[PDB]
């Protein structure tokens, strides 16, 4: 579950 911009 993605909760963040990584780049």
């Amino acid at each position, epitope marked *: *579950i*993605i*909760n*963040k*911009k*990584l780049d």
Partner: antibody
Amino acid sequence: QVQLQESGPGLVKPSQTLSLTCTVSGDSITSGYWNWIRQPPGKGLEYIGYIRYSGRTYYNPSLKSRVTISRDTSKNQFSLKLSSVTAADTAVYYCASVYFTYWGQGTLVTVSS
Amino acid sequence: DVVMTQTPLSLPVTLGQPASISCKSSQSLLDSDGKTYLNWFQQRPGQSPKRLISLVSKLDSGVPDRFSGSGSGTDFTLKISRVEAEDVGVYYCWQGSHFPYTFGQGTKLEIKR
């Protein structure tokens, strides 16, 4: 599950360098993102930055001139260096996995002569 | 950076009653990819923060459905339908659509039992 544990000196003299290490068990640091974040006394959370699966780093521009995050994939460890500390750097320092899913228990660093 | 502000900072709640925490950000968190990276941590006493809610309203794993989240663009709400003892702690909203990631002051939820 992934386990993290930070280690480092609890005491740092003003204008010296703080060094911390995070040891990761259960998965390789060649694969994720590895974050540092801190909690000053009573003053919410402050993001420090990360190192990536590839070694690329991102630093909070509030700190980027004095901060280094590095890694030793042989020991499955990544580390934090914050130079020229002041009492403003007194905090609990946490390491955490990508998306902050897994956390270490934190280590208190006190800046004092 | 993007500023996160929570209200109240202190929230006494009778056991079994509902509880609400509001979070507001100084910028929209709706990214052009359609996602809104407003999230909530729960920091139980003596522990590190843990993921509570991701993307405004998706409950993270192991989180009871008494928790709810809401809002759009700049105004956000954490809700607990019936407060139970395990809810003791500090709650932080944070933001992951702009670098650096930024965190609220935290709201301390104290329980009336």
